[PDB]
Amino acid sequence: NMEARNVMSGTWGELWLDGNKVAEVKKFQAKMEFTKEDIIIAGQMGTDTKYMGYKGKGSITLYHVSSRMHKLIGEKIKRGSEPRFVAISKLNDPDSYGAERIAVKNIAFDDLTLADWEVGVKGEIEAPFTFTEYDFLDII
Amino acid sequence: NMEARNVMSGTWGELWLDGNKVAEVKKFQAKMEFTKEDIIIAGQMGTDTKYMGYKGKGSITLYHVSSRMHKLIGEKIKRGSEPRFVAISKLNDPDSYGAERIAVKNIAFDDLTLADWEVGVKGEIEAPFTFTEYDFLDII
Amino acid sequence: NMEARNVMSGTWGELWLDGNKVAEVKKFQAKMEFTKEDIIIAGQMGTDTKYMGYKGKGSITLYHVSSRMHKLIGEKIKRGSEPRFVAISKLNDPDSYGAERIAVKNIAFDDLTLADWEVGVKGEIEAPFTFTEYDFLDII
Amino acid sequence: NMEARNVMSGTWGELWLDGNKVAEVKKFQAKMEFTKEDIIIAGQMGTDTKYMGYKGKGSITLYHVSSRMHKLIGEKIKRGSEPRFVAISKLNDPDSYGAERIAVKNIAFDDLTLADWEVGVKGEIEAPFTFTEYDFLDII
Amino acid sequence: NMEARNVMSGTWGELWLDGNKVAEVKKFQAKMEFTKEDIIIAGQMGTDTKYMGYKGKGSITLYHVSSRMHKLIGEKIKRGSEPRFVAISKLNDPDSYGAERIAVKNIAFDDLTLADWEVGVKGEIEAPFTFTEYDFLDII
Amino acid sequence: IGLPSINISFKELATTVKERSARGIIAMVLKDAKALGLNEIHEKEDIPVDLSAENKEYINLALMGNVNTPNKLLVYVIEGEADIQTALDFLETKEFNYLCMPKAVEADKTAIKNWIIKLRDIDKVKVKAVLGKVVGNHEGIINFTTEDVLVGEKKYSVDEFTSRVAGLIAGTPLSQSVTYTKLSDVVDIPKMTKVDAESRVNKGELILIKEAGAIRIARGVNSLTELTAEKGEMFQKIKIVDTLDIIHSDIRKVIIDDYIGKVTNSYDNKCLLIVAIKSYLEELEKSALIESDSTVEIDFEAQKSYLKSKGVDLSYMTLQEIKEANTGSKVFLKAKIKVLDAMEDIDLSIEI
Amino acid sequence: STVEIDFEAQKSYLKSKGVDLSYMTLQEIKEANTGSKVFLKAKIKVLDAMEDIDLSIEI
Amino acid sequence: QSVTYTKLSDVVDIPKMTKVDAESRVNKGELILIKEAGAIRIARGVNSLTELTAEKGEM
Amino acid sequence: AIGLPSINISFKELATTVKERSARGIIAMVLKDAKALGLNEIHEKEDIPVDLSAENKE
C-alpha cells in the first residue's frame, strides 16, 4: 500500500489569506507547541509531565511581486489597532490518497517589512505570525 | 565472532503506534537521561555523584502520507484532555544475531504539526515525545 | 497572471540619503518589529497576545568610494549633538507591475566606521540604523 | 493512585462576584488563619497551644478591561456605607477527579485602585479583601 | 566509610496522615526548637545557657488533587472544636543503610487554604502545623 | 405543558439507606406457584407482591450487606414439582457470582454441587454457591453449618440462612475479609464448645461462633480440605479465591471481546496481546489488589512441546526460530503474580 | 510466493499426445508446444486466526 | 477475520444441547450454534471436509 | 481432531528449575547383561531399557 509516489509534493500547495488567493506562496507553516510542567511523584524514578496549554506559531514566505502586507497592516498598525486574519491552506497531490485543507484563525503577524533588496538578488519576503484557533476540512 | 555484516542496518526497523502499524516510518528514537547530583566528600580529591532519577525522551520522523497525528491528538488537545499512547519498535537484521523489540509506554507528544510544505520539497513530519515506562521483549 | 519575470530584481534599486542620491548602494533594509505580551485567558487552552508597539530597524551597505558617513556624523557625534536623517528607497523593475517608493524618517545611525581595510580585499561599509516614522509613495 | 494528569490546572478556574461572572479574572485565593495561644503545662517539656479563632484573608487580580471595582464600591465608600459581597469560585479540570466549588461570604475589600498605568506595560489590578464565612458545594 | 550512594534521596519518602496514606505528598518536615536562657556566672568570661523546653514545628506540601484538608478540619474548626492528628513519615532509600520511620503526635494545623489557583500554573497546597510528641521506629 | 409549578413542601426526617456497592452479584432461586420468571431486584422496596411473605423474608435477609448492599439480585421462580436442572439451564446464561437456594433437599444440593463443579472444571467459568450441608471438596462450594439461627423471635433452619450468608459475603469489599464479622440482627445461637469449633474449622465448615458481644463468623475458609503440590493452603481462603476469580473474569472478557477470530495468529499480534495483558496487570497493581513486580511472557516449553507433537524437526533450529514459529491457532503464554493475606492472628507478650 | 509452469501436467499432456519425453532436457520440455493448453502452478501461504489461548499463572 | 464465536443477535433460543455432543459433532465436521456467555454465537468455522490425505491436510 | 474453542486460565504455584542438557560429548561404554544385547544409544535419563539390572543402571 505504501509507495514512494504517495508522498505529498509541496509544489501542489495553495493558500488563501483574508479570502484572497495568493498565487505567490513559497512555503506555509503552522504548528502548535504544548506547555508542559515536570511533576515528581514520590516512589517513582521516572518523572512525569502535566499538559497545561499550547502556542500556535507559523510563517509565510512569498516572492516579492506586490505590496500585499503593506496594504494589509501598515496603516492600522501605526494607529494602534491590530487586525486579525484567517488563512486556508490546501495540499492536493494527484498521486497521493487525498487532499488536506486546514483553516487557521485569529492570526496576528509579528513584523512588517518595508524594504529589503540587494543588487543581483531577487526579492523575497518572510512573515512570521501567531494564531489561536483552527478547523479541519477534508482530512485524509 | 564479529563480522562487519553483524552491524544492524536501520532499514530493517518496524514501528507500531497505538496498536497500528505505520509503514511510512523514517527513524525512531528513545533514550533515558539520568539526573545526577555532585557530592564532595571530605578528604577525597575526586568528586562523586548521586543518582536521583531519569528522563525519557524520543522522537518519530515519518514521510507525510496521511493525517495520523491530527486524528490522534488534535481534537482532544483543544478540549483539555491529554492522551497517552504505547509504541513498539522492532529491529531485525537478517545478518545479525537476533531481533530487538522494545515497548515504550506512557508516551505524551510535545507538539502537533498542522501544515509544513514548500515548493519543490517533499513533505516530512517530526514528532518529539516523552515517556516514563518500557518493557523488554526478545533482547539479544 | 504571474510570470517568473514579475519578481523584482534588486539591481533596480535606488537610494536617496539626506536629499542626496547615493549611486553606491549594495543593499537597503527597513523593517518594523512588533512588541507583544502573552495573555492567558481562563477557560481557553490557546494563549493570546496583546500588541504594545514597534521597533524600526534597518541597515545600509555601500561600496567604499568616499567619506560620506564621516562628513555626515563624525564632528557632530563628538560634540554631543545627534543628527537625524530621511531616506527614500525606490524599487522599479521594468518587468514588474509597478514601482515601490518608501520614505523612512527620523533615522539615527548605530555606529561610525573610520577605517576597515585588508590587503587583497576591496572596501565595503555597513551602517545599521533605527527609525520611527515612514510614508508611502506609489505602492503597488 | 496518584497520576500527573490529576493535578488541577489553574486555567480552568471561574469566578462569580456579587452574582455576576467576571471573565477577566486572573487570580483568586482565600485562606483562614488560626489564632493560637501558647500554654506551658507543669511537668511537660513540650509547649502546647490553644485555638481561639480565625481570620479570613484573600485577594483577587483581574486584567484591566473595565471600571468594575469603581462602580462596585467607590461612591458608597465616600458616604460612610460599607458594602459586603459574596464570591463563588469554581475549579473544574477535565483530567481531575471532579469539580470544586466554594462560596465566600461577607467579603470586605481593603482598598480601591483609581488608576495604575505604565507606558509599554499592560494594565492589571490587585484587590485584597477579608471575609468571615464560607460554604462547600461539590466537594471532592 | 562514607559513599555518595548512601546519601538519602527524598523521592523515596512516604507519609501517613490520620491513618491514611497520602499519595500526592510533596514535602514533609518536623523540627524541635529548644528554649534557652542566658546565664552569666561571676568570674567566667564566656556566657552559658540553661535549657528550659522546646516547641515543635513542621510543614506539609501536597499536589492539589483533592479536598483532603477541607474534609479533615473545615466543619470542626467553625464550631470551636480543634482536632489533633498523628503522622508517620518513612524514608527508605534502596542504596542507604536502612529505613527511618518516625511518628509525630498531637499535631495541630495552623491554617486552612480554601482556594489558591493561578491561570497557567498547577495547584499546590502548603500546610504548617505544630506538634508535641514523637516516637522512634526503625532508627538507623 | 401546564402552568408553572412552585411547590414548597414540609415533611419530617426520613431514614438513610445504606450505600449501594458496585461489586457483588448474587442469584437466588425461589419456589412460588405464581409469578415465575427472572426478576432483577435492585432495592429492598421493589419486590413483586405475588411472592409469599416467607419468600419476601428470604429476599430481605439476602438484601442486607456486611459493609454495603449487594449490587444486584437475580431471582428465578419455579412453581415446583420440577427438576432443578431446568432452572440451572437458565442460570447458565446469566452472569452471577454466588448462588443460593433456601428451600433445598439433599438431591437438589447434590445437583447444584455437581453442576458448579462441572462448570468450574470443564466450562472454564468461575462461580460459587453457598450450601447448607454439603461435604464437597471444591473451592467453589461453601459449606455453612449452623443450626437454629433465631432473628427477631423467629426460627431459621441451616438451609434457609444461606441467603443471609451469601449476602454477607457479597457485601464485603475486596480489601477485607469475613473473619470475625459480626451480625447485629442475629440474637441467639445454640450452645456449642470451642474444641468442636476447632475441629469443624479444620474440617472446612464456615460456622457461626459466639464471642465477646454479638455473634460473629469464626473463620473465612472454603470447603477445600485435600491439598496438593499445585493447590496449597492459599486456595482455602475465600478472599484469595475471590480476587483470582475477578482476575480470571476480566482477562477472559478482554480476550473474548477483542481477539478471538478478529486478528491473525502471528508473532507480532502475540506481542501485542502480551503488552495488553501486562497493562492490565499494571492497572491491578496500582489498585493494590496484587503485589508489584508481575510479569507476562511467552511460554516457551509448551510451544516447543506442541511443535514436537506435530512432528516438526527441532534439529538445527535457533531459539528465535522456535519462539517465532507458526503454531496454527494456538497461543501459549505464562504469567506470575503475588497476593497477600489479611491480619487474623496476633501474639503480644507483656513484661511487668 | 512463486509462479511457474506446471511441469507435471505438461508432461502428462505430452504423453497423452503421443510425444516422447525421453532424451529430452528439462528446458526443452518446459517450452514445448502444447496446442491450445496452458498449465501453470502457483504456491502461496495463508495464516489462521487466534482461536485457542493458554495462560498459566503462578501465585 | 473468521466466523468463530460470531454472535447472532436475532436468534433467541436453541434446544438443550450438551458440550461433549458439540465436540463430537464438530469433530465429524458440522456447523452448529452454541450457547455461550452473552448472546448466541457460532461454535467453530469448519466446513464439511473430514478426509485427511497427504494432498489436503488440516488447513 | 478439531474441537470447540478453548480459553483456559490456570492458577498454580511453586515451579522448579532443572539442569541444562548439552550437545557436547560422546562416550563409549561397555556393559554386561544377559538380555537386551547389541548397542544402546541413550540421550536422556528416561529412555533407559528396563531390561538392564539396577547394578547396570548405576
Author numbering:
A (entry chain k), B (entry chain a), C (entry chain l), D (entry chain P), E (entry chain B): 3 to 142
F (entry chain D): 3 to 354
G (entry chain C): 296 to 354
H (entry chain C): 178 to 236
I (entry chain f): 2 to 59
Copy out sentences from the published article reporting this entry, exactly as the authors wrote them.
Here, we report the atomic structures of an engineered diffocin, a contractile syringe-like molecular machine that kills the Gram-positive bacterium Clostridioides difficile. Captured in one pre-contraction and two post-contraction states, each structure fashions six proteins in the bacteria-targeting baseplate, two proteins in the energy-storing trunk, and a collar linking the sheath with the membrane-penetrating tube. Specific attachment of baseplate tail fibers to receptors on the surface of a target bacterial cell triggers conformational changes of the neighboring baseplate, which leads to reorientation of sheath proteins and contraction of the entire sheath assembly. Since the sheath and the tube are anchored together at the opposite end by the collar, collapsing the sheath pushes the tube through the baseplate, driving it to puncture the cell wall and underlying cytoplasmic membrane.
There is a symmetry mismatch among the three major parts of the diffocin: the collar (C6 symmetry), the trunk (C6+helical symmetry), and the baseplate (C6 + C3 symmetry). The inner tube and outer sheath are tethered together by a hexameric ring of collar protein (CD1362) at the collar-proximal end of the diffocin. The N-terminal domain of the collar subunit binds to the tube, while its C-terminal β-strand extends towards the C-terminal β-hairpin of last sheath, forming a three-β-strand handshake interaction. These interfaces are maintained during contraction, enabling the collar to function as a force transducer between sheath contraction and tube ejection. We define these conformations as conformers A, B, C, and D. As the trunk assembles from the baseplate to the collar, conformer A forms the first layer, followed by alternating contributions from conformers B and C, and finally, conformer D terminates the sheath by interacting with the collar. The density of the TMP ends at the collar region and it displays higher flexibility.
